[PDB]
Amino acid sequence: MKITTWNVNSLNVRLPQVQNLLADNPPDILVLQELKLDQDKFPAAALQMMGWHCVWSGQKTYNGVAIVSRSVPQDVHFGLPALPDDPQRRVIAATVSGVRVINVYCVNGEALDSPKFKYKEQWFAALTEFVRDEMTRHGKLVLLGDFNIAPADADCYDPEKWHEKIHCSSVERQWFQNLLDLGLTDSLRQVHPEGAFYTWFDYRGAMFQRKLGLRIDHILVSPAMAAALKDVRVDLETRALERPSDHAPVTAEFDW
Ligand SMILES: O=P([O-])(O)O
Numbered sequence: 061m062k063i064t065t066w067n068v069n070s071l072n073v074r075l076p077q078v079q080n081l082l083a084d085n086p087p088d089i090l091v092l093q094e095l096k097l098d099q100d101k102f103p104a105a106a107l108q109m110m111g112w113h114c115v116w117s118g119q120k121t122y123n124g125v126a127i128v129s130r131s132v133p134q135d136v137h138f139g140l141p142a143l144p145d146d147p148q149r150r151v152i153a154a155t156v157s158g159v160r161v162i163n164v165y166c167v168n169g170e171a172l173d174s175p176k177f178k179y180k181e182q183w184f185a186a187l188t189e190f191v192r193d194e195m196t197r198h199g200k201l202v203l204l205g206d207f208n209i210a211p212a213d214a215d216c217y218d219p220e221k222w223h224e225k226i227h228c229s230s231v232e233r234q235w236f237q238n239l240l241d242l243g244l245t246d247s248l249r250q251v252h253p254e255g256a257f258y259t260w261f262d263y264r265g266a267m268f269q270r271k272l273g274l275r276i277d278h279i280l281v282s283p284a285m286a287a288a289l290k291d292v293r294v295d296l297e298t299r300a301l302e303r304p305s306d307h308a309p310v311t312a313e314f315d316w
């Protein structure tokens with residue numbers, strides 16, 4: 061089984077690339093963040109007509125998350141029970157081929173002194189509660205997406221420049237640890253304990269061409285999935301395309 065997560069930085073813009081990714085060596089499940097499309101503007105026909113089932117949660121301009129799979133997604137769930145009236149479209153879950161898939165587009169946070177950083181804190185607390193509950197029922201569970209958190213200094217290029225800055229702060233790293241502490245494994249680091257595996261590269265300054273990025277897109281797995289884990293890779297071919305998303309897809313492959 062292959063599961064890919066990709067922050068597409070607008071699905072309107074990236075649709076042809078999503079289509080090309082589904083057409084050649086496709087994953088079994090592709091989850092998307094930053095649709096940036098209202099619910100009724102999601103290109104459902106374009107993907108469905110390719111033989112893919114889609115569930116999604118969109119809003120105008122911002123955010124937006126989708127799950128795309130050749131299996132029909134079951135028991136679809138939207139949002140966070142502990143933050144039930146947040147209008148921001150950031151969490152969608154569904155059971156796909158017996159695996160509980162929770163797709164997140166986590167709060168960026170902006171800056172440690174931004175009011176959006178307090179939002180980030182409360183939002184992560186709410187996510188932890190939902191994930192903890194979901195894990196009591198599904199032995200095969202995958203929590204994946206753009207976490208907007210770089211777990212350790214190997215995940216932030218030039219770590220001295222990012223010392224207690226957004227994405228790379230000690231407190232953000234604690235929020236990421238709180239998810240692992242539920243009984244989940246950072247899949248990429250199980251397979252590749254050492255080395256840079258950046259998933260986001262700023263468009264400004266040609267950072268992708270300079271190899272300078274953050275590892276903020278992750279695939280967190282329950283033990284039953286960890287035991288079956290074969291590889292985790294960052295799809296830099298897709299990031300190297302003309303007019304790319306600033307994030308690269310990340311794929312985990314499971315082998316039983
Ligand atoms: O969705 P924002 O406008 O609060 O960033």
Ligand SMILES: [Mg+2]
Nearest residue numbers: 069070094306
């Ligand atoms: Mg973006």
Ligand code: NA
Nearest residue numbers: 121122123168
């Ligand atoms: Na933004």
Ligand code: NA
Nearest residue numbers: 293294295296
């Ligand atoms: Na790669």
